[PDB]
Amino acid sequence: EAEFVRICSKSYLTLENGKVFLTGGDLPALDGARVEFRCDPDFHLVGSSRSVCSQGQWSTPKPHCQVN
Fold first, then answer.
1. 2, CA 20 to 30 Å: which among 15, 30, 55, 59?
2. Whole-number Å distance between alpha carbons of 32 and 42
3. What is the CATH architecture assignment of 1-68?
4. SS (H, E, C) the chain
5. CB-CB neighbours of 44 under 10 Å
6. Which residues form each disulfide bond in the chain?
7. What whole-number distance in Å separates Cα of residue 59 and Cα of residue 31?
8. Whole-angstrom Cα distance, residue 28 to residue 66?
């Protein structure tokens, strides 16, 4: 089922002035992976600081880092 890569948008992994703590890899659909968002020691994360991968799609949309 699904389509193309059986993994939630890898884009989330990369974030400007921030690092994502992925935890799933590249398993079928990846209906279990969990990524912990966190902004560098300058900007404070204010949103979906947490997103669980499922059915090749992240539960919550990528957030954003706000300057202190």
1. 15
2. 30
3. Ribbon (2.10)
4. CCCCCCCCCHHHHEECCEEEECCCCCCCCCCCCEEEEEECECEEECCCCEEEEECCEECCCCCCEEEC
5. 13
6. 8-53, 39-65
7. 10
8. 34
